[PDB]
Design a protein around this ligand. Sequence first.
Ligand SMILES: *[C@@H]1O[C@H](CO)[C@@H](O)[C@H](O)[C@H]1NC(C)=O
Ligand SMILES: *[C@@H]1O[C@H](CO)[C@@H](O)[C@H](O)[C@H]1NC(C)=O
Ligand SMILES: *[C@@H]1O[C@H](CO)[C@@H](O)[C@H](O)[C@H]1NC(C)=O
Ligand SMILES: *[C@@H]1O[C@H](CO)[C@@H](O)[C@H](O)[C@H]1NC(C)=O
Ligand SMILES: *[C@@H]1O[C@H](CO)[C@@H](O)[C@H](O)[C@H]1NC(C)=O
Ligand SMILES: *[C@@H]1O[C@H](CO)[C@@H](O)[C@H](O)[C@H]1NC(C)=O
Lengths: 49, 246, 234, 246, 49
Amino acid sequence: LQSLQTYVTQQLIRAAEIRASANLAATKMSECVLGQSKRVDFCGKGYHL
Amino acid sequence: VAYSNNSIAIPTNFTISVTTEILPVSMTKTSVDCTMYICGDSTECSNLLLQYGSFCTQLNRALTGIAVEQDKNTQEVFAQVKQIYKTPPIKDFGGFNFSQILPDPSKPSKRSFIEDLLFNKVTLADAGFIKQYGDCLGDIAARDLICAQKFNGLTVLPPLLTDEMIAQYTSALLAGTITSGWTFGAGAALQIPFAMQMAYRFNGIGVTQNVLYENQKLIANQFNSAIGKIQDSLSSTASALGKLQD
Amino acid sequence: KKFLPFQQFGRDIADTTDAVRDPQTLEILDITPCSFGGVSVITPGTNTSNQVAVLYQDVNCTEVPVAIHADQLTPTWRVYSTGSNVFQTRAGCLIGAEHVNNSYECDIPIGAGICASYQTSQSIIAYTMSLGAENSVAYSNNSIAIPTNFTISVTTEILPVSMTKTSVDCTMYICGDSTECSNLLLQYGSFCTQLNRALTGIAVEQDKNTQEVFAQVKQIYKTPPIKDFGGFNF
Amino acid sequence: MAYRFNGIGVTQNVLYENQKLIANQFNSAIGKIQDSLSSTASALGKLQDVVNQNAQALNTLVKQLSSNFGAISSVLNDILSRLDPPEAEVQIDRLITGRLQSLQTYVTQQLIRAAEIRASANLAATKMSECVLGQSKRVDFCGKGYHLMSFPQSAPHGVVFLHVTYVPAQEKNFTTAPAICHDGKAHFPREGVFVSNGTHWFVTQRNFYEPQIITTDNTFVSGNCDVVIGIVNNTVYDPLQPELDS
Amino acid sequence: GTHWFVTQRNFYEPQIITTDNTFVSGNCDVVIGIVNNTVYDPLQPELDS
Ligand SMILES: *[C@@H]1O[C@H](CO)[C@@H](O)[C@H](O)[C@H]1NC(C)=O
Ligand SMILES: *[C@@H]1O[C@H](CO)[C@@H](O)[C@H](O)[C@H]1NC(C)=O
Ligand SMILES: *[C@@H]1O[C@H](CO)[C@@H](O)[C@H](O)[C@H]1NC(C)=O
Ligand SMILES: *[C@@H]1O[C@H](CO)[C@@H](O)[C@H](O)[C@H]1NC(C)=O
Ligand SMILES: *[C@@H]1O[C@H](CO)[C@@H](O)[C@H](O)[C@H]1NC(C)=O
Ligand SMILES: *[C@@H]1O[C@H](CO)[C@@H](O)[C@H](O)[C@H]1NC(C)=O
């Protein structure tokens, strides 16, 4: 039970990190793919097209 | 920097550059049978575990919530547009060549060449439980292979979205970006020549469109060279996909 | 497996026996457990209906009565282990679901593109999901499309801000009003201090979350008495 | 509203010529939102997870006291009234370890849930500081479509945003050219798109149809007209030429 | 070093300084580092009657 609890807690932390990464990826999709972003160094490096 | 109160530097040319960014989306959806993992159908062990309470139900609920959250992340990162746009049969986008990124109709899988390289790069060669669980699906020639609970109840759930529909969504996004620009994201798709889209995206960064209309051939050649360089770098032995491998 | 001579049994990484040798004929065997507990059920709401369909996870439809030993169970378990509406997919075996060739929006997700919904003679149907409406763009190198009208639309977005501020007394929850038990609790250290401090930090963070969201401005602006907004009605 | 229309590339004369239509469309959209919210829709489920998960975790915390964790009884007073401290302490510490481990598990899950709320609250504060306090050029951040304004509303354990967006409709096909060659010189549009109905050439803005006569005020000249791919020969009207009679 | 020109900030596109691409605001003495130069007027190269 201690081993399973450790595994579940580590999986929860990793899932939170994956959630943050997926939210960042969805934001990058919605900005750079569906339009042009004026934010510097958000979509690649330099002036984004 | 040669700084002064009356000196400025103005570029005389430019270089179109294509870079690669890799971001993780989802993880492996794993479900654990707590009672099976604790013991192998021992009724005395089950009776002793029932004295502890609702630990196994809580862990199963947490794992189910994790899997549902992974599916929600994939759906919210890929199903941005509900209109599945198709690529035009004739491709004359001002000399720009998108053959490396467009889907290939010559294969049952709708993945592109670059997508095929990405799929071939990431592998489960030296993995442990995941590769052993996936090998049971390649061992279907032998009957009576109950590999679902063979590893003490540790199961791997298949994703809600498979690779084919994800590739279809990416192809639809590429078609909407090429044919409609940024208009299809806000609302209904508006067809537009690719030169107009390049001109207005040049205008969005403070560059007049006559630069594009005078150097379109050079811009297309530089873009094709950058696409070829990206393809050659991805096809090389460099481990550029280490983020998903982690 | 080439069993060199007196090496008799085997085990995996988790020390469970996977190979064994018969002590009489000296033949070699392989071992695969057979319990199964991973069942899934797709059902609508009880306030709506009472029909129920069950998914058998990662097992073939031809091996259901052997893995679960259905013939030794109730006939209601038998009729849900063998029936007319039996379907096999990548996710596993579905019994009771009505497979159709149509495609709709996903209602109850199963896996590998399989979704179920309640359809009218009401029954639970199973179908492959539809990504969306099929669309094509009439692309050309000299043709453009310009909109002639527009529609103002209002969309609703909901985001959580705060969370219920809970506070737990560690000494009370472990054992109430017992001095002997409280004496034994001090032998475990400052575990109660850590839990009280962690929950206090959560409650402060919840108040910070409400403060940092709703107090972007520091002046309370009163609404004007007249509503002359050019036809806009707020 | 005229300035916010100017923020998405629409000229302010379009809003003033259709102010009554915009106000009627906005009031109908508010009533449609009000009628949809007043119905039996379950769109408030995002706030419902916070309430239900807290209620489930609190009930699981209470129900964990019923477990004996291998002791004689789950009641502390039963052990204290039946046993003596020379032999009661071997039964108490099993209940101590079981209940403390449940308290460790609950607080750990609360900390993970608090971090999830922290990410959502930071996103809500970012949306409030951008959509409400100004106009955002970012795509699909303040709702789907071209964002104009937003209205925040209070909610139990959350906030509700009412994004007012701009969605074009009633598309029409047109024939376009990148530039116009008039006297051997290429004329490019200053802001809009060169369009034609097949008989006459007009210039209109990108996000709305409003044809205008091609003049020197709305066009600029850059280089010869031999290097532009797809150029169309057409005349350019001079607003100064009829006034030269003196 | 010989003649003055006006160009955009991201590309070298020298042009003749006219009244269309410029505007007038204030006198010469307030601006620090002003340079005396002529400005072409496209209204009257020869446009007289
Ligand atoms: C399930 O049964 C089908 C047909 O009998 C067979 O082709 C397939 O390999 C079986 N799957 C497994 C995992 O045994
Ligand atoms: C045990 O006896 C059986 C029956 O005669 C025989 O077939 C088998 O070979 C014997 N095994 C050994 C190890 O002698
Ligand atoms: C429950 O069912 C009743 C009718 O039996 C219906 O009026 C009601 O709206 C239903 N509730 C929900 C939440 O669907
Ligand atoms: C569904 O498609 C299969 C072939 O994929 C066909 O055999 C079957 O008759 C179809 N059923 C219906 C109801 O169209
Ligand atoms: C557009 O493509 C067609 C081929 O379908 C070609 O004949 C025509 O010249 C092209 N026009 C321009 C302006 O590139
Ligand atoms: C610019 O710097 C030079 C070098 O120090 C100096 O001589 C000149 O006066 C400066 N210009 C102004 C306007 O101060």
